[PDB]
Amino acid sequence: PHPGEALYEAQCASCHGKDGKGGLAGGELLGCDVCGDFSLLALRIEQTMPLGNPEQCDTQCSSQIAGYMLENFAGLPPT
């Protein structure tokens, strides 16, 4: 059971891709401003994503997805 993976696939991958590189120019995820700090990544997700409808993903959802992405997307933290 990997709820963060499942939630990311259901609510995020449509735009951000299976590996986080979805969208123009390599995507918004790898190296993002808050992507080095679990709590700030989760907070940004909670506040703003999915785009235009953040309530689709509850607080727990945002935490689980942030964990999934930090654990599975190489190069997510800013260098």
Ligand code: HEC
């Ligand atoms: C589903 C739950 C998610 C998660 C975890 C993320 N997104 Fe998105 N996202 C989209 C666009 C166009 C941007 C650029 C911002 C803008 O100009 O409005 C983003 C940005 C992000 C970030 C980076 C934020 C930062 O701190 O700079 C992160 C961490 C992020 N997203 C995560 C577009 C979309 C979608 C398009 C329809 C969907 C769906 C999502 N995002 C969903 C999610």
Ligand SMILES: [Cl-]
């Ligand atoms: Cl997970």
Ligand SMILES: [Cl-]
């Ligand atoms: Cl991808």
Ligand SMILES: [Cl-]
């Ligand atoms: Cl795009």
